[model samples]
Target: MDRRQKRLIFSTITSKMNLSEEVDLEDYVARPDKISGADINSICQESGMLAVRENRYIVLAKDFEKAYKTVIK
Candidate 1:
């Protein structure tokens, strides 16, 4: 198959995975780079994007990576 056709097929299969719910953060304001870590945490908490901490000490939500990119960028 041609590259374009292959890409389309791949995209269709890749999007079939049922991941976490989509969060609407369009109204959320991003913090300045100089903001303290605590301030960043507060932002995440308010937006329901903060990663939960289980006994394992680190917890990442299914949507965290995708949403985080846009938030920090």
Candidate 2:
């Protein structure tokens, strides 16, 4: 997304998924970001999947950070 909506949309998905997360997910998102699509599917899938790949509950800020790293790369 160019600025806000996409992040907000992701936020919404996070909530609907009932993710009992403990990190400030908003902080980990990219801003100068642009490479992903509006990718309704890709957006939610990748972000959530990051935590699962780590074999830990995404309760740490580290989850968000690593997930962001994956997205930013």
Candidate 3:
């Protein structure tokens, strides 16, 4: 099998997860021009919502799931 065929397995727990009717992951992926920067990080860090990793993207620790789309564009 090729790459896409090999990656099609489903997670057992995902069956119980609810789909959000309004939150489209596609919207985030389409908006490559958008990104949070240093000033936002300073504010978010004080509020305990942001964090930095060496050689990695600045992430929102409290809302990490919201920070990224699962599919690669």
Candidate 4:
């Protein structure tokens, strides 16, 4: 897995959302190449989109946490 690129993918994707919003990647833990950017899109999209549905502009750490577990599983 190109973790460098994978991290970039995550950063770029959430960056495309609201620029004002900050996604806390500090506490976020992304799995390895067991899944790649495909799962990246899935994890990012599902969590961030759900965050929006929750009426939250910022996608929190737990959002990624939830999505990683859900989508990766």
Which candidate number would show the highest TM-score if scored against the true structure? 4
Off by over 4 Å in 3: 1-17, 33-65, 69-73
Query: Candidate 1: what lDDT?
Result: 0.36
Give the clash count for model 2.
0
Over 23-50, each residue of candidate 1 has an lDDT whose tens digit, in order, gives: 3232222222333334334444422433
lDDT of 4 by residue, 1-73 (tens): 6666767877877777652345565334345436677887888888877788789877776678788888887
Query: Cα deviation of 32 in candidate 4 (Å)?
Result: 3.9
Q: Per-residue lDDT tens digits of candidate 3, residues 1-73?
A: 2222222211121223233344332333234433333322332333223233332333332322433322221
For model 1, give the 10-residue run with minimal summed lDDT.
23-32
Model 3, CA-based lDDT:
0.30
Q: TM-score of model 1 relative to the true fold?
A: 0.24
What is the C-alpha local distance difference test score of each model?
0.36, 0.57, 0.30, 0.70
Error of 4 at 54 (Å): 1.9
- Pitting candidate 1 against candidate 3, the one with the higher TM-score is 1
Using lDDT as the measure, name the better of candidate 2 and candidate 3.
2
Q: After superposition, how far is residue 17 of candidate 2 from its true place, in Å?
A: 3.6
User: What are the root-mean-square deviations of the candidates from the true structure over C-alphas?
Assistant: 12.6, 3.3, 12.8, 2.7
lDDT of 3 at 58: 34
Model 2 spans > 4 angstroms off: 18-21, 35-43
Tell me the RMSD of model 3 versus the true structure: 12.8
Cα-based TM-score, every candidate: 0.24, 0.53, 0.23, 0.73
Ranking of all candidate structures by their lDDT, best first: 4, 2, 1, 3
